[PDB]
Amino acid sequence: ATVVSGQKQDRQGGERRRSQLDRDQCAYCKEKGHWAKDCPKKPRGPRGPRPQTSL
RNA sequence: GGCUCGUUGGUCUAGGGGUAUGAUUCUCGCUUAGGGUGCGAGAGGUCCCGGGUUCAAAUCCCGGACGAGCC
Ligand SMILES: [Zn+2]
């Protein structure tokens, strides 16, 4: 006789840790009026070695 | 042994140099008995990360060990 590995355990679903979105919201923090590319939660503010307002 | 680690708005595509191209997707109209199929419009990308190079280069060239940090 011969036998080999197979099958998988039971699984579930309902979401992807994302919820509803729109082109006016942010993917990183879920706020509105901006996108992740400009998110205020990122280390690219409020101060750094490039103020971008005096240079 | 303990603690922290929310960037889903494309993906795939060749890369003998231009942010893009090609294949597919989502929404709506028209088409159809019908969410289908085709066509048009709208939703679409500084295409591994950092550094170097002539206007412009994933594999142009170069580095990249078991995920990382703290106690
Ligand atoms: Zn944000």
Q: How far is the CA of A53 from the C1' of B44 (A)?
A: 32
Residue A34 · residue A26 · CB < 8 Å? yes
**Residues forming a β-bridge with A32:** A25
For chain A, the residue count is 55
Closest nucleotide to the alpha carbon of A42, via C1': B7
Nucleotide B20 C1' to residue A51 CA (A): 32
Q: Domain of A51?
A: 1-55
CA distance linking residue A31 with residue A8, whole number of Å: 38
Nearest to A24 by CA among A12, A32, A14, A16: A32
> How far is residue A45's CA from residue A16's CA, in Å, rounded to a whole number?
29
Cβ distance A29 to A41 under 8 Å?
A: yes
DSSP state of A38: G
Distance A14 CA to ligand 1 centre (A): 24
CB-contacted nucleotides of strand B (7 Å): 6-9, 43-44
Structure tokens at A17: 């840790």
The burial class, CB within 10 Å (0-12 / 13-18 / 19+), for A7 is: exposed
Tally the domains of chain A: 1
Tokens of A31: 């706020």
